C-alpha cells in the first residue's frame, strides 16, 4: 500500500517503490495545485535524467561513498533504520551527493562518446 | 552559470549542458506561462524519445552527415564557431534532420525487435 513500508526497514521498503511512483501523479487554485505537482514530478524526472537514471527506480552509479556522511555498516543502515531516519541523518549532504552524481554522469557520457568514436 | 558558455566555442559549451538543462523547469497569465513552459519541455523530451535519446544529454545517432547542410570541417565547427552561429548555419535544415532521425530510430527499433526474436 501507499507508504505502507514507511515504518518498515529500508531493505524491505525498497520493494514498494512502484506504489509511490504511481501515487505521485494519481478553481484557479486547483489548477495551480495540479501544475505545481506536475512541476515537482518533472523536476524529479529531470534530476534522474541528468544522473542517467530516467528509466529506473533503482540505479547504481560510479560515485563512491565518502563514509564521512555516514559511517554505519550496510547491515545497520538497511535492517535497523527507517527511510525517515536515514533521510534525517544525511540531510546536510544530499546536495553534495547530487552534485557528484551530475559530475559522474557527465564524465560517463563524454567517455561513452569517445569510446563510440573508435572504429 | 546559466548561458555562461553561450559565447564560448561549441566544444567548451558542450561541457555546460547540465546547468542549462536544469534551469529549464526552475493570476491566470502566469499559470498559462507555467503550462506553456511545461509543454515546451515535454515537446523536447518527446523529440528525444522518438530519436531514442530520452536517457542522456549527449546522444549519438546513426544518421550520417549530409555535408550539403554545412561543408565546414569538424575542427572549424567545434573550435571556431559558437552555438548561435551554428544554429544560424543550419537553420534551414532542421526539419529534414529531425525527420531522418525519426526514420532512423524507427528502423533501429524494428531491427531490435527482429534480433530479439532469434532463439
Amino acid at each position, epitope marked *: 500500500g501507499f507508504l505502507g513500508a514507511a515504518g518498515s526497514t529500508m531493505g524491505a521498503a525498497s520493494m514498494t517503490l512502484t506504489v509511490q511512483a504511481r501515487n505521485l501523479l494519481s478553481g484557479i487554485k486547483q489548477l495551480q495545485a495540479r501544475v505545481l505537482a506536475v512541476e515537482h514530478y518533472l523536476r524529479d524526472q529531470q534530476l534522474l535524467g541528468i544522473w542517467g537514471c530516467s528509466g529506473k527506480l533503482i540505479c547504481c552509479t560510479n560515485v563512491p561513498w565518502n563514509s564521512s556522511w555516514s559511517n554505519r555498516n550496510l547491515s545497520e543502515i538497511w535492517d535497523n533504520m527507517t527511510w525517515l531516519q536515514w533521510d534525517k541523518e544525511i540531510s546536510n549532504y544530499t546536495q553534495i551527493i547530487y552534485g557528484l552524481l551530475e559530475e559522474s554522469q557527465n564524465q560517463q557520457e*563524454k567517455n561513452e*562518446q*569517445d569510446l563510440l*568514436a*573508435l572504429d | 552559470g546559466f548561458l555562461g558558455a553561450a559565447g564560448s566555442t561549441m*566544444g567548451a559549451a558542450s561541457m555546460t549542458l547540465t546547468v542549462q538543462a536544469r534551469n529549464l523547469l526552475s493570476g491566470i497569465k502566469q499559470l498559462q506561462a507555467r503550462v506553456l513552459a511545461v509543454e515546451h519541455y515535454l515537446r523536447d523530451q518527446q523529440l528525444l524519445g522518438i530519436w531514442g535519446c530520452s536517457g542522456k544529454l549527449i546522444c549519438c545517432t546513426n544518421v550520417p552527415w549530409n555535408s550539403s547542410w554545412s561543408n565546414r570541417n569538424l575542427s572549424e565547427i567545434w*573550435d571556431n564557431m559558437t552555438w548561435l552561429q551554428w544554429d544560424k548555419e543550419i537553420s534551414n535544415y532542421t526539419q529534414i534532420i529531425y525527420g531522418l532521425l525519426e526514420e532512423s530510430q524507427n528502423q533501429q527499433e524494428k531491427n531490435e525487435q527482429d534480433l530479439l526474436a532469434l532463439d
Partner: antibody
Amino acid sequence: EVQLVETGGGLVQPGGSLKLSCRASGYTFSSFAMSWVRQAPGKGLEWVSLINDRGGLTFYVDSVKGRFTISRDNSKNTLSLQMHSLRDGDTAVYYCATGGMSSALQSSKYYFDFWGQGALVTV
Amino acid sequence: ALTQPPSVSGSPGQSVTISCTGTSSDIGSYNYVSWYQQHPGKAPKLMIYDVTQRPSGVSDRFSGSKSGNTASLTISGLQADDEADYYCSAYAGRQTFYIFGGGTRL
C-alpha cells in the same frame, strides 16, 4: 616546437615495480591523447598503451594489460606508466608519444606524431 | 603483426618502395596506415600518415600508397640523410589498437 622528456629507472630486479614519467613542452596535455610505445632491444616498435586526452580512458595490448597502467595528470603536465611484475620480456626502450586517438570533436588522428627520446628499461 | 622487408638497397637517382602487408580485414577496414623513419640512435620520426597524407616538415619525395591488404612507402631522390630504419604501422580497431612491422634499412 614540442619536446617530450622521460624520467625513470634502469636495471631493476624481477618482481618489483617501476614508474616511468613523461613531461613535455609545446602543447597542453588535455588537448591531445598520448601513448607509450616501446622499441624491442633487437627489433622494432611495439605499442604498449594509449590514454585519452582527458585521461578517462586507458587502453593496453593484452600482453601488458595485467602489468602496465597508464595515468595522466593535466595540472602537472605529467604522463606516467606504472609497471608491475616486471617480466624479463619487458626489456625495451620506452618512448613517450602524442596522438593515437581523438575525442570526436577533432578529426580522428589514429597515428602518432611527436616523439621523445625514450628511456631504456631493463630487467 | 605486419610483414615488412628486412632491408632494401637504395641508390642516388632511383626510387625505392618499402612494402608492408597485414591482415586484409584490419588494413582494408581501417585506412590509417602510417610510416615512420627511425634514424639509428634516435627516436622514430613520423614521415607519412593516412594513405596519402604527409606531416609538416617532411618533403613531397615521401609518399604513401595502399592497395588491397598492402601498403607501401615510395621515396625518390634518396639522400645520404635518408638511410634509416623505416617502419609501417596500422590501426587494428578496439581490441588491439596498432599493429607494427619490423624495420627496413635503406
